Amino acid sequence: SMQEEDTFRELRIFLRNVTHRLAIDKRFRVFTKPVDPDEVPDYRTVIKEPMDLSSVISKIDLHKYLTVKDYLRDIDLICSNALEYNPDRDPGDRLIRHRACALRDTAYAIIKEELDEDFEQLCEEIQESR
Numbered sequence: 001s002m003q004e005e006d007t008f009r010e011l012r013i014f015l016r017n018v019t020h021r022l023a024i025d026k027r028f029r030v031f032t033k034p035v036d037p038d039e040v041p042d043y044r045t046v047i048k049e050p051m052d053l054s055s056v057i058s059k060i061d062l063h064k065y066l067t068v069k070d071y072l073r074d075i076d077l078i079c080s081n082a083l084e085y086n087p088d089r090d091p092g093d094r095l096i097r098h099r100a101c102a103l104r105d106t107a108y109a110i111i112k113e114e115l116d117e118d119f120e121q122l123c124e125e126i127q128e129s130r
């Protein structure tokens with residue numbers, strides 16, 4: 001229905017706004033663009049599904065997310081990729097891990113405050129009907 005297409009349009013507006021707020025935070029610059037395959041050729045041998053905030057913006061506009069749950073699976077993948085690629089005790093690895101945890105925690109805290117639980121349940125029930 002037109003009403004259901006208005007629901008998904010409001011979801012995309014919400015997700016673009018959350019993503020922009022994460023992408024401008026200086027702590028998260030390391031998560032804004034793909035890891036460059038020239039500078040780091042080893043990356044794509046270890047990390048089998050790369051993800052970053054520019055790719056998330058492109059996915060919103062391709063209508064890849066019908067629920068906030070499917071958006072948060074890609075925020076969780078950004079964070080888990082950084083934890084698995086940089087697991088060591090040295091300061092460089094510990095700094096990215098702390099930033100990855102802060103990107104995940106910050107996204108979940110904006111959603112807990114600003115997403116209405118009945119708006120998410122509506123998106124889930126339209127998705128489950130298709």
Ligand SMILES: COC(=O)[C@H](Cc1ccco1)c1ccncc1
Binds near residue numbers: 030035039040081
């Ligand atoms: C999302 O970025 C990463 O996982 C890279 C891994 C990387 C790049 C070069 C060598 O290793 C990283 C970038 C900056 N600081 C720590 C790690």
